[PDB]
Amino acid sequence: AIGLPSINISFKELATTVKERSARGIIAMVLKDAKALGLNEIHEKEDIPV
Amino acid sequence: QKSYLKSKGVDLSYMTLQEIKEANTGSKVFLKAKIKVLDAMEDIDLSIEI
């Protein structure tokens, strides 16, 4: 509900990109392995199953 | 400087040469210079007309 009046200033550096991804284009890959079974969406390199 | 800016990902298509000259680069500074190094005489050639 109503809280105390709040003034918050946020600093964020949204400049961390190169070769930006296109809005279009979706690739689906199916693989045979013993682990990580199921769907694992991969948005970029940092989130890769280990 | 242009290569560094392109690596940063900024678009230089519309900027003037002056604008790219004074674009913010952070800590790094890029400069270049031209000099010519003198040398003492080592070879002498003379032609004499009698």
**Experimental technique for the deposited model:** cryo-EM
C-alpha distances in angstroms, B48 versus A43, B41, B43, B45? 82, 20, 17, 10
The resolution in angstroms reads 3.6
Within a 10 A sphere around the Cβ of A12, how many other Cβ atoms?
Answer: 5
Output b/e per residue, B2-37; b: 16+ Cβ within 10 A.
Answer: eeebeeeeeeeeeeeeeeeeeeeeeeeeeeeeeeee
DSSP B4-46: HHHHHT---SS--HHHHHT---TT-------------------
In degrees, rounded to 5, the angle at the alpha carbon of residue B27 between the alpha carbons of residues B26 and B33 is 105
Query: A18 to chain B nearest CA, in Å?
Result: 6
Dig out the tokens for A43 from the structure.
């948005």
Which residues of chain A have a CB within 8 Å of the CB of B8? 15
Question: Maximum Cα–Cα distance for chain B, whole Å?
Answer: 71
